[PDB]
Amino acid sequence: SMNGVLIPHTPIAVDFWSLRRAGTARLFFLSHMHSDHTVGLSSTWARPLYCSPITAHLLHRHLQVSKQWIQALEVGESHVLPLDEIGQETMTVTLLDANHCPGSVMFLFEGYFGTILYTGDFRYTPSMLKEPALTLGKQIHTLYLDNTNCNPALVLPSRQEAAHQIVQLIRKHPQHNIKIGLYSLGKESLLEQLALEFQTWVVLSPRRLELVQLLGLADVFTVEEKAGRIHAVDHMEICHSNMLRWNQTHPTIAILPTSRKIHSSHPDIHVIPYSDHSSYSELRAFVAALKPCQVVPIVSRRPCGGFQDSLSPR
Ligand SMILES: [Zn+2]
Ligand SMILES: [Zn+2]
């Protein structure tokens, strides 16, 4: 899927890389390095690209986008970007920690269009309201929201509570190897927590270890499989056939940390609602505190509602 947006009546494109559809009167932004946000973005990209410093490093390393075009913006600062070559108009952009994955940010856009807050992918935490850029009384005219888990019937625990569910599960199997199905990026802090909790080395891929060292996490990761019982694998590897394959070597439990209602054939495959996306209740509190004039879903194909009673008149 493609979860990028061309914001109408603005010079803004976020996680949206189709040259034909975007046009030439746009500035391009990248919230984070998940593949559904970099569709069409590769080493051939030849336009200015604005992102976080961590995203900037990952972008050049793994997609080979030239450093000529990569524009790393410091988080928490107001950046003034030119919209033309004659110093006629500018746009002010402020990056805010999205609490989603390494490098993930929210964008605060200010310009002729007004004020727009673009969350990208984010997990709401109350500290986001205490952001200096959001405590200036500025009216947010449009709030683009991560509506991934925007289902009122879907109750999700906090990441800490979900991490506890994972810990409890692993505790029941002290003799088992543990397969954690992940994307190439994200939930590294979960791995670090599991490493310390069970005093084990967490086996990664050479790519992940390279990433972890950038984050400056604890020295608890390695590429040698014989070193630990907790293994970070690609989520696609977790299925019935691979469970039988893995059990030939050692008793194995597989864990899928996701808010998606994935069902498994194998009894030893566990799907636990550990999510990097805000829950419905967290979304409600986020919007209620900001009170924007309008709320627009980033994930168009997915449901998004229940925010009329939290909007602002202006
Ligand atoms: Zn994401
Ligand atoms: Zn996404």
Author numbering: 0 to 313
Q: Can you list sentences taken from the study reporting this PDB entry?
A:
The two human DNA exonucleases containing an MBL-fold are SNM1A (also called DCLRE1A), a factor important for DNA interstrand cross-link (ICL) repair, and SNM1B (also called Apollo or DCLRE1B), a DNA repair factor that also plays an key role in maintaining overhangs at telomeres. The SNM1A and SNM1B/Apollo proteins are both classic 5′-3′ exonucleases, requiring a free 5′-phosphate to initiate digestion, but are members of a class of DNA processing factor family that have not previously been structurally characterized. The protein exhibits two structural domains: the metallo-β-lactamase (MBL) domain, arranged as a sandwich of two mixed β sheets (α/β-β/α); and the β-CASP domain, which is characteristic for a subset of MBL nucleases: CPSF-73, Artemis, SNM1A, Pso2, as well as RNaseJ.
A 2.16 Å crystal structure of SNM1B contains a single protein molecule in the asymmetric unit, with two coordinated zinc ions and two tartrate molecules at the active site. Motif 2, H31-X-H33-X-D35-H36, contributes two coordination bonds to each of the two zinc ions. Zinc 1 is coordinated, in an octahedral arrangement, to the protein residues H31, H33, D120 and H99; two additional bonds are formed with the carboxyl (O4) and hydroxyl (O3) oxygens of a tartrate molecule (Tart_1) from the crystallization buffer. The binding of tartrate_1 to the zinc centre is suggestive of a possible catalytic mechanism, whereby two oxygens of the phosphodiester to be cleaved are in positions similar to the tartrate carboxyl oxygens (O1 and O4), and a nucleophilic water or hydroxylate ion is coordinated to both zinc ions at the position of the tartrate O3 oxygen. Tartrate_2 is held in place by direct interactions with the side chains of Y182, K186, T257, S258, and S274, and the main chain amines of D275 and S258. In SNM1B, D35 is held by a hydrogen bond to N2, which probably stabilizes the zinc-coordinating rotamer; there is no corresponding residue in SNM1A, and the amino-terminal is too distant in SNM1A to form such a contact.
